[PDB]
Design a protein around this ligand. Structure first.
Ligand SMILES: [Zn+2]
Ligand SMILES: [Zn+2]
Length: 79
């Protein structure tokens, strides 16, 4: 705690909550506008993101559509 000891770092907001970024939480990158958002603010689970080849923000999906998915074709489906 001290007046000084500043960070001297600037970072614009990308998410809809006018936030730059949140470590604790996971954030995805839109493959349309190149914007970052919180998996919770958008509704995308980090565990699922790894499968999302091209995440589509809730602002572009209204024109482009849903988020693309990778191929992950490693062996025949096992049910
Ligand atoms: Zn957010
Ligand atoms: Zn977008």
């Amino acid at each position: 705690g001290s007046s000084g000891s500043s960070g001297m770092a600037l970072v614009p907001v990308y998410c809809l909550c006018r936030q730059p970024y949140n470590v604790n939480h996971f954030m995805i990158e839109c493959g349309l506008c190149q914007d970052w958002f919180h998996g919770s603010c958008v509704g995308i689970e980090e565990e699922n993101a790894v499968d999302i080849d091209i995440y589509h923000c809730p602002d572009c999906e209204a024109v482009f559509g849903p988020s693309i998915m990778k191929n992950w074709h490693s062996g025949p489906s096992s049910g």
